[PDB]
Amino acid sequence: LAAAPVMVNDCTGKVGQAVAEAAVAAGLRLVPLSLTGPGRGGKRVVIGNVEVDVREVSEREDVVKEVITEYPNVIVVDYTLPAAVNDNAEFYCKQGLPFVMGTTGGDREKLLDVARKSGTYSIIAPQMGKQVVAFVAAMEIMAKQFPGAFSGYTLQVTESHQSTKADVSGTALAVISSLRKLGLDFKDEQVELVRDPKEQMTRMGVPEQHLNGHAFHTYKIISPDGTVFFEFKHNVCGRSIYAQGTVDAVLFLSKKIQEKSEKRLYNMIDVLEGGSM
Amino acid sequence: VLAAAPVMVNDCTGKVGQAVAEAAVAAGLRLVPLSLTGPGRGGKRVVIGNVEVDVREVSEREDVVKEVITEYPNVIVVDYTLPAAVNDNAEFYCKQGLPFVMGTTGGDREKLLDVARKSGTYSIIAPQMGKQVVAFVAAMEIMAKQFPGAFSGYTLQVTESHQSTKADVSGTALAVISSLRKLGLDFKDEQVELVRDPKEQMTRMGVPEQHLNGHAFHTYKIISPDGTVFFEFKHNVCGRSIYAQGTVDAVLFLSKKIQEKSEKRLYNMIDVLEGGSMR
Numbered sequence: 415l416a417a418a419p420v421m422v423n424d425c426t427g428k429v430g431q432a433v434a435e436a437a438v439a440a441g442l443r444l445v446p447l448s449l450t451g452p453g454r455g456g457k458r459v460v461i462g463n464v465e466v467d468v469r470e471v472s473e474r475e476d477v478v479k480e481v482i483t484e485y486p487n488v489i490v491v492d493y494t495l496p497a498a499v500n501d502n503a504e505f506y507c508k509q510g511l512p513f514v515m516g517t518t519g520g521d522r523e524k525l526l527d528v529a530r531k532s533g534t535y536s537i538i539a540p541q542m543g544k545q546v547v548a549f550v551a552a553m554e555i556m557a558k559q560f561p562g563a564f565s566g567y568t569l570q571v572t573e574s575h576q577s578t579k580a581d582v583s584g585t586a587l588a589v590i591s592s593l594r595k596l597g598l599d600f601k602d603e604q605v606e607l608v609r610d611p612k613e614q615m616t617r618m619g620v621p622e623q624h625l626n627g628h629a630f631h632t633y634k635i636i637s638p639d640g641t642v643f644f645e646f647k648h649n650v651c652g653r654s655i656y657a658q659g660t661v662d663a664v665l666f667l668s669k670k671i672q673e674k675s676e677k678r679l680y681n682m683i684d685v686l687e688g689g690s691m
Numbered sequence: 692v693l694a695a696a697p698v699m700v701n702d703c704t705g706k707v708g709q710a711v712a713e714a715a716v717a718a719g720l721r722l723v724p725l726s727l728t729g730p731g732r733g734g735k736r737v738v739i740g741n742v743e744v745d746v747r748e749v750s751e752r753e754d755v756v757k758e759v760i761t762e763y764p765n766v767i768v769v770d771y772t773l774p775a776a777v778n779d780n781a782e783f784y785c786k787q788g789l790p791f792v793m794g795t796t797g798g799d800r801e802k803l804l805d806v807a808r809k810s811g812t813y814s815i816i817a818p819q820m821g822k823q824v825v826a827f828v829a830a831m832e833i834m835a836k837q838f839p840g841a842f843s844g845y846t847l848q849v850t851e852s853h854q855s856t857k858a859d860v861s862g863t864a865l866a867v868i869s870s871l872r873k874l875g876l877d878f879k880d881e882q883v884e885l886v887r888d889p890k891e892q893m894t895r896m897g898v899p900e901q902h903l904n905g906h907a908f909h910t911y912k913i914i915s916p917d918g919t920v921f922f923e924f925k926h927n928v929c930g931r932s933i934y935a936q937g938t939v940d941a942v943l944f945l946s947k948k949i950q951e952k953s954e955k956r957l958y959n960m961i962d963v964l965e966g967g968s969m970r
């Protein structure tokens with residue numbers, strides 16, 4: 415590939431590891447340095463056939479000078495923790511480092527502000543499963559073109575995630591928001607969170623190996639008389655969809671940088687519009 | 692409050708025509724108590740809700756329409772007849788200046804749309820009136836054009852159930868598959884799995900036993916190369932009510948366009964969806 419090399423912070427996190435493995439398998443160059451979180455020690459990890467020197471976040475200035483002098487065209491991929499989001503972003507923007515930020519949480523308004531204001535080439539997208547982004551944006555296209563089209567219908571929404579998210583998924587909320595414009599009446603509190611593993615397996619169909627990394631959503635829309643039934647599901651096991659979307663985002667941003675686009679801040683919709691590469 | 696034109700349903704004795712009239716009445720549209728039935732059917736009085744409809748032979752259609760027009764000048768005609776009557780009924784409506792909603796399938800569809808456009812008659816010609824199904828279809832296509840190859844590498848299975856003897860993939864399924872191809876799925880029309888065994892229609896598609904001869908259940912499954920991502924979309928229709936309810940909406944939409952004197956005369960069900968809910 416004519417694509418920029420990538421530094422994945424943190425390649426020891428669950429999604430960060432998946433991204434790095436997918437980047438390597440795809441034929442991107444993985445920078446053999448990574449930054450891990452506060453309270454984690456230095457270590458050597460194997461990603462494919464690449465040995466990555468994982469360094470403490472206290473060393474991040476030194477580490478980035480080293481990455482920048484050896485890999486000037488580097489793009490950083492950030493899958494860290496909500497706590498690090500705005501700080502990592504300000505760090506990348508101050509250093510002129512182009513980045514793909516997949517980490518959720520943080521102050522999303524300040525995040526987008528700093529990236530746009532500095533004019534740093536970036537993709538900031540809290541859902542990098544691009545196929546899920548396409549479904550979300552379909553529901554919203556439907557919602558914009560055809561307001562009230564399901565007026566009078568009943569909505570049920572059910573979803574399953576690791577019991578490390580007490581909360582309704584951002585994806586579910588965004589879809590429900592479109593469904594309201596389609597004339598459904600449904601409060602966020604009505605989402606049915608499935609959190610029992612027995613039930614996640616036996617009723618939602620989540621495989622036993624994926625109980626701690628999955629995102630299963632079901633939306634049902636039923637007419638007042640019960641004769642019309644619509645059902646939409648998007649069920650993700652593990653993290654490969656996030657990994658594969660991140661690779662595409664890096665390939666897209668690579669090109670924008672090579673071309674010197676006027677536009678600097680992109681999202682996953684922009685990536686989807688460009689097609690598969 | 693609806694404030695809509697009164698409707699004449701031809702033929703209120705046909706299966707879909709009756710369903711439309713009953714749904715119109717229950718919704719609070721005014722049903723004109725005259726209807727036209729097909730050649731070889733006799734005159735009769737039918738009850739639609741608590742409205743007694745004088746069903747007249749199609750040979751009397753000149754007399755019938757003069758009677759409807761003098762009591763209900765703002766009438767909109769809803770046509771659910773038979774492929775054989777489509778082009779003739781349409782030419783009749785356009786000659787008389789009667790606005791119409793044509794739900795009947797078949798006929799020469801090019802001549803049909805030509806006569807309506809040429810005469811400048813307010814009309815909705817839509818061979819699929821299940822508006823919620825139309826909205827889903829049209830979304831998928833917009834999505835598909837916006838996001839080319841987005842599911843490139845994924846596998847597609849398509850299953851659908853209809854009354855026995857449907858040999859051909861539903862026009863709705865084909866249109867959705869066509870969008871799915873633009874999203875990078877590689878899938879021939881022949882690979883649609885027609886479910887036609889009633890045991891299987893019930894046990895596997897969920898079709899209720901009473902609806903085995905009148906239903907349209909579709910399932911689209913999209914799976915990633917590694918098998919870890921599964922998308923499933925279903926749209927399942929039992930009987931005729933979705934067509935009835937969409938016809939009411941079409942009449943409400945056309946009513947408004949007529950009241951406003953739109954420059955545009957010939958509309959379809961996409962145009963109705965774009966106009967929003969009116970109930």
Ligand SMILES: NC(=O)c1ccc[n+]([C@@H]2O[C@H](COP(=O)([O-])OP(=O)(O)OC[C@H]3O[C@@H](n4cnc5c(N)ncnc54)[C@H](O)[C@@H]3O)[C@@H](O)[C@H]2O)c1
Nearest residue numbers: 424427428429449450451494495498516517518540541542
């Ligand atoms: N965009 C998406 O599609 C998507 C999908 C899944 C998860 N996520 C999000 O991505 C993030 C990571 O999820 P996960 O399941 O990989 O969690 P994880 O805890 O396994 O990994 C996060 C890693 O980040 C490290 N870290 C913390 N602060 C850091 C810093 N300042 N610099 C470098 N590394 C730091 C931690 O030590 C940890 O190993 C979460 O915010 C999660 O919500 C996003």
Ligand SMILES: NC(=O)c1ccc[n+]([C@@H]2O[C@H](COP(=O)([O-])OP(=O)(O)OC[C@H]3O[C@@H](n4cnc5c(N)ncnc54)[C@H](O)[C@@H]3O)[C@@H](O)[C@H]2O)c1
Nearest residue numbers: 702705706707708727728729772776794795796818819820
């Ligand atoms: N747009 C849609 O989505 C949709 C949905 C369901 C059915 N349909 C179509 O609607 C049509 C009617 O279906 P159905 O089950 O009600 O048919 P049906 O056989 O039950 O009734 C049709 C009626 O039309 C009458 N008729 C024939 N010629 C006529 C004329 N010149 N004027 C007045 N009446 C006349 C017949 O006597 C008959 O009773 C079919 O072509 C069918 O494909 C369309």
Ligand SMILES: [Ca+2]
Nearest residue numbers: 704705732735
């Ligand atoms: Ca009869």
